[PDB]
């Protein structure tokens, strides 16, 4: 499984 | 399950219907750092009535917000998908429903 | 704020056209929608007219609304008046903050026939006597007009102590009902030969009598 | 079909609090402005409060400002009226109303009675009003129930759990000098059914959580 | 369905209808889009008035699309409003 | 400030295709209905097509139905006019217009010239119009440049690379029976500067990429 | 569909009030907004009036719009008329599908001073003669009003074949210019003693002559 997510979303996660 | 994700590359500036509508609205910032997205612009009707043909607030009709149910992300490492209600804009309603 | 002035009552004959006016004290009447409600005895109000002249389905064509800018008043017109149109009528309007009702108008349909009361008198029950109490119950119904005199007698003697009588109330058929209660001790009840409830209406009397045992 | 069902009414001591509810159905609740309107016994309709469809705007009569709070739960289709610092002048039937726009009410609920009094709750004493030869009218006979000394209003009366409706006459209550109420309910029945049919009056007094089912039979 | 939650679509001076935009390769599969009934707005007498226009209010919303997925920004019409050429 | 910049105009053969663009800035493009209006030389304004803010509704003049397509790209703030099956009668300056509502245009672009003809691009031949005794009176000499047989419009003429503006007169083009254009540009100069000042006309015909710098001198 | 009828031309004297009417053939005029545009020579149209009577900033107070529902027509009124108001004016309106412009009105402001034309005639250049071609160029500038007649002579003989003349157009100084071209073979050019361009403006004729070599 692979899920393409934007840059602003990952920064918020980490 | 193994998600194995990949990272890829204001409403006033996109639309001005808020100023041109017979049921005009203003946009207010709803800030929340523990929610994704942090900033949500909410529509707030300027008047109770609607702007009539002469430019006056007419109370034979009402400006009402159009609310849309949207899924938002929240911190609760762990996250939760919450259903929130947001006002996108305003419309003009009257008590007399016509057929045409 | 503002007020809405309505006549306290209006009287007309069946088949005639009746108008109920509603005058706004301050603010332009034509700037805000006028509603009219009908209220029958012991019932929730119902809408007759909304948005000045809109008649909902179920409301007869006989009812109509209008507004007059020069007189700053709204009107409810009833053409072909029927006996079933007897009720209270309230106008209502608003401003950008408040909502205001008029004081209400009692509509009287004239020339309705004079009806004699139906009277039923009950003596105290055995259960109530056993509880050292005694109530005589005089029930009066289907009379028209609403004026009624209720007198009680202990044998042939008038009695005023212990009597509680309702003011007449309008029934669904436009006639009136009332009730009268005579409170006695079991000893007063048992010591007399009889008690009577006398009901006078339009000069005619109906007397009911009950006796102990 | 539009339905507005009010709940929460009853007796409250002066200075007390009470919350009214109005359950709505038969329409898209969140797209309607809602109102509360009251009526004191034998008086006119008096607007209390209003709330927009979203609940974002609230409006109040001067007589209730600061003391009452209108609110709504759009997920539950319920309108509320929280009343604090109640006084005798607040005694009324409170109606829930649906508005097409602010100030244009289209539908009314049935109402809920609110009594603001320092007098205590009293459940009724229910007595049979037995049919006798002195209560018969040939083919018909009158029998009833006396609902004595209750407080506050209202009481509701049915006959044979609602299966008997024809010939039923429940009279308006008398307000006694004691501050207590009394009422009677009479039913006219065929005289030939008197020792064949059981007649029971069902008296409900929700303010005292009392329900009385009284059997009324001929006296012999 | 938005008809069951709100009836502003039928009561607006710029009324709208709701059309199902179906896509099995997108999450959610069904999206209800508002389409203005008239070009003009319904005036005080109940007629379509062409001194004004019914226009859709569009909202940018994130949607899921097709083992691998991508988060796409899509534009949806929530409802209609009435605009005039004279701003007061 | 509202800006509407048209592009894509040029010479096309009958039956041909061309796409026009209009780049907009200074306003929220997606909330405006947009229009295309055309003007044939020396004629009136003629509406071509319109599109709602969202692009969901399109409108067309009868003269262009089935041949032209109006479209817009709201992410790029661009309006398009795809013109298929072109004919001679479609020759005009095409203007992009912003509408406050359908049919209420508030702003116009600068236009883009579309030429539909079976004649092909022809660069002009540039000839000097020498100052002489016949072009001299009252201390002034007339000298010029003949810009002969070009197609299509437009041509641009300057003198001494723009340093000479006083006494310059560039005349409107003649449309010959051949379908070709010709124009002349003249400058009136002090007669005493003849033989001392160099005069050069700078001719540019962008449709055929022709740039000619012609020295104009007295004939001897 | 529908049409909009405007007068082809209007002429008025300065300082006066001028009205340009626009009549709608079918459909009620009052149902759709009327726009008015000004177009100067070689320029994009500009809005003078939008939404029947709205005047944008930058447009002088002298310009005003109105509608007449009884005559199904719109009007553009210009008070205190100035020479700078000379231009073409188009009315425009619509229906639920179409957008229609009127034919346009050329507005002329009267009383402007008369101006005689400067005429210059050039013979063919050596370069053109070498290319076996020959063009005579007659340039006419700075004349007012715009009406001019151009005639050519081969010696004293009128010549009509090979002549191309522009319709006159306004210059930046608000005066008119025109040009006339006479196409000849080098043989026709060399065989005559001279060629002349005769220009008639307001009853006066100027004649210019050129000769081979
Ligand atoms: C799908 N099921 C069974 C549902 O019950 C979902 C809902 C109903 C439905 O079917 N509705 C169709 C119409 C529809 C479709 C999609 C969206 N989008 C979002 O909710 C997304 C979240 C999200 C959802 C899915 C995929 C990726 C994704 F990231 N977030 C924002 O849009 C957002 C965050 C901040 N600002 N915004 C504007 C909204 C509306 C939908 C929200 C309420 C319940």
Author numbering:
A (entry chain I): 1 to 14
B (entry chain A): 22 to 30, 36 to 102, 108 to 131
C (entry chain D), G (entry chain L): 1 to 9, 11 to 27, 27A, 27B, 28 to 68, 68A, 68B, 69 to 210
D (entry chain C), F (entry chain H): 1 to 52, 52A, 53 to 82, 82A, 82B, 82C, 83 to 100, 100A, ...
E (entry chain B): 36 to 101, 108 to 129
The authors write:
The cytokine binds to IL-17RA with low single-digit nanomolar affinity. and the structure of their complex is known.
The crystal structure of the complex of compound 1 with IL-17A reveals that binding occurs at the dimer interface in the central pocket formed by residues from both IL-17A monomers. Upon ligand binding, the main chains of Leu120 move 3.4 Å away from each other relative to their positions in the apo structure, and this results in separation of the entire N-terminal β-strands of the two IL-17A polypeptides. The same movement eliminates multiple steric clashes of compound 1 with IL-17A and results in the IL-17A dimer interface area being decreased from 1666 Å2 in the apo structure to 1127 Å2 in the complex, and the number of interchain hydrogen bonds in the cytokine being reduced from 22 to 15. At this binding site, in addition to the hydrogen bonds mentioned, the central phenyl ring of compound 1 is deeply buried at the binding site and makes extensive hydrophobic interactions with the IL-17A dimer. The 2-fluorophenylalanine side chain makes hydrophobic contacts with Leu120, Leu122 and Leu135 of one monomer and the cyclopentyl group binds at a hydrophobic side pocket formed by atoms of Glu118, Ile119, Leu120 and Lys137 of the other monomer. The crystal structure of the complex shows that compound 1 adopts a U-shaped conformation when bound to IL-17A.
